[PDB]
Amino acid sequence: NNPLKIHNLRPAPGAKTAKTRVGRGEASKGKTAGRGTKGTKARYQVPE
RNA sequence: AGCUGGUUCUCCCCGAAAUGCAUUUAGGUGCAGCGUCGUGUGUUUCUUGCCGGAGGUAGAGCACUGGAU
């Protein structure tokens, strides 16, 4: 009983993965946002 | 701008590198080394004992070459 209502929909577990917000706080992808310090790759992309 | 600075909430698990080659190359980067996660394998890793191997260092020596009372 109590049929499917639109507030009962949930995705299959593992379907949706929360984004990775780099640059917020130091207990996460911190100040460098996973880049290191002062290289060509600390500001730019190196072509393959 | 191969350059300088800045990049904001939390906790749980693991956790390095500053080495090799090459480089209009040396404070940069490519590959390899070292980290992590997923998947397959499952003791293959590592330590100690024993066994089979090649050597030319420490030491020693003058048989070769050289030095030398």
PDB file of C-alpha atoms (C1' of nucleotides) in Angstrom:
ATOM      1  CA  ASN A   1       0.000   0.000   0.000  1.00  0.00           C
ATOM      2  CA  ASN A   2       1.145   3.655  -0.063  1.00  0.00           C
ATOM      3  CA  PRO A   3       2.094   3.623  -3.758  1.00  0.00           C
ATOM      4  CA  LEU A   4       5.165   5.151  -5.356  1.00  0.00           C
ATOM      5  CA  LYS A   5       5.122   8.927  -4.888  1.00  0.00           C
ATOM      6  CA  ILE A   6       7.553  11.316  -6.535  1.00  0.00           C
ATOM      7  CA  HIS A   7       9.335  11.930  -3.218  1.00  0.00           C
ATOM      8  CA  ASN A   8      10.069   8.196  -2.956  1.00  0.00           C
ATOM      9  CA  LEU A   9      12.389   8.036  -5.978  1.00  0.00           C
ATOM     10  CA  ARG A  10      16.030   7.324  -5.147  1.00  0.00           C
ATOM     11  CA  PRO A  11      18.877   6.383  -7.500  1.00  0.00           C
ATOM     12  CA  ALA A  12      20.468   2.974  -7.591  1.00  0.00           C
ATOM     13  CA  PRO A  13      23.233   2.858  -4.951  1.00  0.00           C
ATOM     14  CA  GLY A  14      26.563   3.925  -6.395  1.00  0.00           C
ATOM     15  CA  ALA A  15      24.927   5.599  -9.394  1.00  0.00           C
ATOM     16  CA  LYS A  16      25.490   9.236  -8.412  1.00  0.00           C
ATOM     17  CA  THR A  17      28.895  10.197  -7.012  1.00  0.00           C
ATOM     18  CA  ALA A  18      29.240  13.542  -5.257  1.00  0.00           C
ATOM     19  CA  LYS A  19      31.484  16.068  -6.979  1.00  0.00           C
ATOM     20  CA  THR A  20      35.030  16.800  -5.809  1.00  0.00           C
ATOM     21  CA  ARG A  21      35.216  20.495  -4.899  1.00  0.00           C
ATOM     22  CA  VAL A  22      38.914  21.341  -4.873  1.00  0.00           C
ATOM     23  CA  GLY A  23      40.157  24.499  -3.219  1.00  0.00           C
ATOM     24  CA  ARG A  24      37.803  24.574  -0.209  1.00  0.00           C
ATOM     25  CA  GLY A  25      39.633  24.163   3.079  1.00  0.00           C
ATOM     26  CA  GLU A  26      42.799  22.340   4.079  1.00  0.00           C
ATOM     27  CA  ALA A  27      41.071  19.112   5.205  1.00  0.00           C
ATOM     28  CA  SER A  28      40.279  18.341   1.562  1.00  0.00           C
ATOM     29  CA  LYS A  29      41.930  19.017  -1.776  1.00  0.00           C
ATOM     30  CA  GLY A  30      43.608  21.946  -0.096  1.00  0.00           C
ATOM     31  CA  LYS A  31      45.362  25.111  -1.150  1.00  0.00           C
ATOM     32  CA  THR A  32      47.215  23.552  -4.086  1.00  0.00           C
ATOM     33  CA  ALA A  33      44.142  21.599  -5.273  1.00  0.00           C
ATOM     34  CA  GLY A  34      46.279  18.525  -5.900  1.00  0.00           C
ATOM     35  CA  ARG A  35      48.971  20.160  -8.048  1.00  0.00           C
ATOM     36  CA  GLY A  36      52.083  20.667  -5.920  1.00  0.00           C
ATOM     37  CA  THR A  37      54.187  23.822  -5.987  1.00  0.00           C
ATOM     38  CA  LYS A  38      55.469  26.092  -8.745  1.00  0.00           C
ATOM     39  CA  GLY A  39      55.960  24.106 -11.905  1.00  0.00           C
ATOM     40  CA  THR A  40      54.699  24.384 -15.445  1.00  0.00           C
ATOM     41  CA  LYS A  41      51.985  22.017 -14.202  1.00  0.00           C
ATOM     42  CA  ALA A  42      51.159  24.149 -11.150  1.00  0.00           C
ATOM     43  CA  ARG A  43      49.477  26.696 -13.432  1.00  0.00           C
ATOM     44  CA  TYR A  44      49.303  25.201 -16.927  1.00  0.00           C
ATOM     45  CA  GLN A  45      48.799  22.048 -18.997  1.00  0.00           C
ATOM     46  CA  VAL A  46      51.709  20.139 -20.542  1.00  0.00           C
ATOM     47  CA  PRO A  47      50.752  18.710 -23.967  1.00  0.00           C
ATOM     48  CA  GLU A  48      51.066  14.956 -24.369  1.00  0.00           C
TER      49      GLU A  48
ATOM     50  C1'   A B   1      54.582  34.841 -18.493  1.00  0.00           C
ATOM     51  C1'   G B   2      59.058  27.281 -18.035  1.00  0.00           C
ATOM     52  C1'   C B   3      58.201  33.145 -13.400  1.00  0.00           C
ATOM     53  C1'   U B   4      56.020  35.389  -8.188  1.00  0.00           C
ATOM     54  C1'   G B   5      51.686  35.416  -5.188  1.00  0.00           C
ATOM     55  C1'   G B   6      46.611  33.400  -3.814  1.00  0.00           C
ATOM     56  C1'   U B   7      43.163  29.066  -4.009  1.00  0.00           C
ATOM     57  C1'   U B   8      37.933  29.264   1.369  1.00  0.00           C
ATOM     58  C1'   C B   9      34.112  23.225   5.610  1.00  0.00           C
ATOM     59  C1'   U B  10      35.225  18.533   8.497  1.00  0.00           C
ATOM     60  C1'   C B  11      36.689  13.541   9.692  1.00  0.00           C
ATOM     61  C1'   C B  12      38.216   8.163   8.356  1.00  0.00           C
ATOM     62  C1'   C B  13      42.187   4.718   5.650  1.00  0.00           C
ATOM     63  C1'   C B  14      46.936   4.570   3.047  1.00  0.00           C
ATOM     64  C1'   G B  15      51.001   7.489   2.147  1.00  0.00           C
ATOM     65  C1'   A B  16      55.883   9.357  -0.727  1.00  0.00           C
ATOM     66  C1'   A B  17      60.244  12.060  -3.584  1.00  0.00           C
ATOM     67  C1'   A B  18      64.508  15.226  -3.784  1.00  0.00           C
ATOM     68  C1'   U B  19      67.051   9.180  -7.758  1.00  0.00           C
ATOM     69  C1'   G B  20      68.439   7.049 -13.353  1.00  0.00           C
ATOM     70  C1'   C B  21      68.230   8.361 -18.870  1.00  0.00           C
ATOM     71  C1'   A B  22      67.351  12.225 -22.212  1.00  0.00           C
ATOM     72  C1'   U B  23      66.593  17.217 -23.004  1.00  0.00           C
ATOM     73  C1'   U B  24      68.373  24.965 -26.681  1.00  0.00           C
ATOM     74  C1'   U B  25      68.723  20.908 -21.074  1.00  0.00           C
ATOM     75  C1'   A B  26      69.938  22.198 -15.577  1.00  0.00           C
ATOM     76  C1'   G B  27      64.765  26.501 -10.566  1.00  0.00           C
ATOM     77  C1'   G B  28      61.164  23.341 -16.631  1.00  0.00           C
ATOM     78  C1'   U B  29      59.410  18.803 -18.718  1.00  0.00           C
ATOM     79  C1'   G B  30      58.957  13.276 -21.114  1.00  0.00           C
ATOM     80  C1'   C B  31      59.841   8.138 -19.637  1.00  0.00           C
ATOM     81  C1'   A B  32      61.511   4.817 -15.556  1.00  0.00           C
ATOM     82  C1'   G B  33      61.962   4.461  -9.929  1.00  0.00           C
ATOM     83  C1'   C B  34      58.836   5.460  -5.157  1.00  0.00           C
ATOM     84  C1'   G B  35      52.168   6.502  -3.524  1.00  0.00           C
ATOM     85  C1'   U B  36      47.151   5.468  -3.902  1.00  0.00           C
ATOM     86  C1'   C B  37      42.345   3.192  -5.807  1.00  0.00           C
ATOM     87  C1'   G B  38      39.773  -0.720  -8.807  1.00  0.00           C
ATOM     88  C1'   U B  39      40.161  -5.690 -10.747  1.00  0.00           C
ATOM     89  C1'   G B  40      42.582 -10.858 -11.339  1.00  0.00           C
ATOM     90  C1'   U B  41      46.123 -13.911  -8.936  1.00  0.00           C
ATOM     91  C1'   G B  42      47.293 -16.092  -3.658  1.00  0.00           C
ATOM     92  C1'   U B  43      52.492 -16.723  -0.454  1.00  0.00           C
ATOM     93  C1'   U B  44      54.624 -16.057  -5.548  1.00  0.00           C
ATOM     94  C1'   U B  45      57.145 -10.930  -1.268  1.00  0.00           C
ATOM     95  C1'   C B  46      60.437 -10.601   2.839  1.00  0.00           C
ATOM     96  C1'   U B  47      63.590 -12.814   7.071  1.00  0.00           C
ATOM     97  C1'   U B  48      66.773 -16.871   8.962  1.00  0.00           C
ATOM     98  C1'   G B  49      69.276 -21.907   8.395  1.00  0.00           C
ATOM     99  C1'   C B  50      71.448 -25.117   4.801  1.00  0.00           C
ATOM    100  C1'   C B  51      73.051 -26.186  -0.289  1.00  0.00           C
ATOM    101  C1'   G B  52      75.269 -24.981  -5.590  1.00  0.00           C
ATOM    102  C1'   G B  53      77.907 -20.846  -7.908  1.00  0.00           C
ATOM    103  C1'   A B  54      81.389 -16.372 -10.150  1.00  0.00           C
ATOM    104  C1'   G B  55      84.793 -12.885  -7.972  1.00  0.00           C
ATOM    105  C1'   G B  56      89.949 -10.134  -6.921  1.00  0.00           C
ATOM    106  C1'   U B  57      87.938  -5.428  -2.297  1.00  0.00           C
ATOM    107  C1'   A B  58      90.240  -5.292   3.152  1.00  0.00           C
ATOM    108  C1'   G B  59      94.472  -7.866   4.402  1.00  0.00           C
ATOM    109  C1'   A B  60      98.932  -9.784   2.802  1.00  0.00           C
ATOM    110  C1'   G B  61     103.164 -10.583  -0.844  1.00  0.00           C
ATOM    111  C1'   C B  62     107.116  -9.533  -4.527  1.00  0.00           C
ATOM    112  C1'   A B  63     106.218 -14.531  -8.575  1.00  0.00           C
ATOM    113  C1'   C B  64     105.170 -10.202 -13.190  1.00  0.00           C
ATOM    114  C1'   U B  65     105.724  -3.921 -14.298  1.00  0.00           C
ATOM    115  C1'   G B  66     107.636  -0.185 -11.764  1.00  0.00           C
ATOM    116  C1'   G B  67     109.845   2.707  -7.249  1.00  0.00           C
ATOM    117  C1'   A B  68     113.885   1.657  -3.766  1.00  0.00           C
ATOM    118  C1'   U B  69     118.521   1.773   1.019  1.00  0.00           C
TER     119        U B  69
END
